[PDB]
């Protein structure tokens, strides 16, 4: 009687691969906008009363 | 005669930038141009020196 274990196995079938990446909050987080400067500077614009 | 020069990757950005020259070409631009002088001030002044 030539059971299972007679027979030999070979090289295991990859079924599937696993990686883990962080759901990156970064784009949604922040206003992004391209500097072609490596000095970026932001304007700050504001109104005042006659007591400043 | 030989002559030698380091520049870093973030300078090649920065020159790039801001000023719009490449800094890779200027090194070249250099130390070909000035090992050139220095064989042309050579030969000019081994004449001084053997001269009578």
Excluded: C
Excluded at chain 1, 16 to 40: E, F, G, W
Excluded at chain 2, 15 to 21: C, D, F, I
Excluded at chain 2, 30 to 41: G, P, S, Y
């Amino acid at each position: 009687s030539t059971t299972t274990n007679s027979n030999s196995i070979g090289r295991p079938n990859l079924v599937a691969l696993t990686r883990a990446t962080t759901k990156l909050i970064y784009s949604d987080i922040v206003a992004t906008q391209r500097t072609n400067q490596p000095v970026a500077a932001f304007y700050g614009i504001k109104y005042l009363n006659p007591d400043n | 005669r030989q002559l030698k020069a380091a520049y870093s990757i973030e300078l090649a950005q920065d020159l790039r930038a801001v000023h719009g020259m490449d800094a890779d070409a200027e090194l070249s631009g250099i130390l070909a141009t000035e090992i050139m002088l220095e064989i042309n001030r050579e030969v000019v002044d081994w004449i001084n020196y053997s001269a009578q």
